[PDB]
């Protein structure tokens, strides 16, 4: 049947970037029409591949990752970037083959009091590896004395909330992001485009 791109792009709620979601796409027909013809995306950047030409290639599996960041940080969703998002939340490899799609979602993810449901990781001793997901909420020990699970001096909660508000400037507003990556294993190809049909 058709690949379920709609339930990724049109999901009611998105994940926080630190706990980014990933949908494994297999054994379906993928028509990328829906995406590249739709003039609804402020970001549609593809690497080592073209959207025009995806519809006639075959892959073993496709991964669709999705999360919310602020517009300021959409530039960090790219190969070779650094920054809090790239270093501690979601990391693309330098040889990334895929596409990065994003759109402004102020009308869905901002609240008047501030939406404190979307978070990002602020402290981490080392950078994530490509496609690594770290969902720890352990108190960050910034000094030598153990924190014993209590926030305080040199003991920081590792996550911070975006607090998206509709009044915010467009650099601070929430953006929904979908990252499509294409993997070619030594195995049969299960995700292709369409073509002609008999009867």
């Amino acid at each position, epitope marked *: 049947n058709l690949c379920p791109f709609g339930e990724v792009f049109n999901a009611t709620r998105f994940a926080s970037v630190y706990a980014w979601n990933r949908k494994r796409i297999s054994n379906c027909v993928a028509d990328y029409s829906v995406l590249y013809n739709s003039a609804s995306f402020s970001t549609f950047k593809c690497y080592g591949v073209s959207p025009t030409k995806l519809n006639d290639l075959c892959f073993t599996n496709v991964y669709a990752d999705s999360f919310v960041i602020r517009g300021d940080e959409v530039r960090q969703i790219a190969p070779g970037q650094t920054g809090k998002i790239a*270093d*501690y939340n979601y990391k693309l490899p330098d040889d990334f083959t895929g596409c990065v799609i994003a759109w402004n979602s102020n009308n869905l993810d901002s609240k008047v009091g501030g939406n404190y449901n979307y978070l990002y990781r602020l*402290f981490r001793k080392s950078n994530l590896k490509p496609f690594e997901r770290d969902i720890s909420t352990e108190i*960050y020990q*910034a000094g030598s004395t153990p924190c014993n699970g209590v926030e305080g*001096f040199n003991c*920081y909660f590792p996550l911070q909330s975006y607090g998206f508000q509709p009044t*915010n400037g467009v650099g*601070y507003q929430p953006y929904r992001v979908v990252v499509l990556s294409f993997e070619l294993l030594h195995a049969p190809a299960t995700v292709c485009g369409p073509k002609k049909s008999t009867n």
Partner: antibody
Amino acid sequence: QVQLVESGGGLIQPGGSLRLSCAASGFTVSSNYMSWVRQAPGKGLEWVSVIYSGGSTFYADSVKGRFTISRDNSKSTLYLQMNSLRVEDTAVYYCARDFGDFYFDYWGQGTLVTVSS
Amino acid sequence: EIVLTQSPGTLSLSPGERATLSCRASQSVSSYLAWYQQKPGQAPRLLIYGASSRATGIPDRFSGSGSGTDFTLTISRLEPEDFAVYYCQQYGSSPRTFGQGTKLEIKR
């Protein structure tokens, strides 16, 4: 009890090099964001450089390519290597504990760098 | 590039009076504003972060308010220690920038 003590400032000719050092205690250097901020004589404050907890590095446009920030955790020391110095670089240089690349909650005492012929 | 403008440049008051210092931002920075205090020859000291939260050990007479492009630092009852230069700093957009400072002078 946080302590930061900068050292290494002095007179240098334009085009020369210097390495400032900041001896820190009361926290784990390798575990924190740290920044260098400078203040020209009688002028305001200008952020110079930052090292993230995870090791990433960022610089102000006026010093990009010439300055390099680094740390040594066993010595508990932060370093700023300045090359190809210009007259405009004359300032007191402050070492600072940086909370998540947002604000500077602990400052050293500063070290004076004079770049002149 | 966010430019911060502080007003007034100099403010002259007697000990015991209330001090009101203004920071204005060229763009919205929404709450990502900090205030620092600097006495002559000494290093700056963090007073307020998040536009309204006091740092550790800072007396209650220091308070911060505002948002977006307009911020205010108030000292309720001026003590002699409080006569210094005060700097606003924004961290809503890279690179972080400071205002040019407000000098608080003793009136006599």
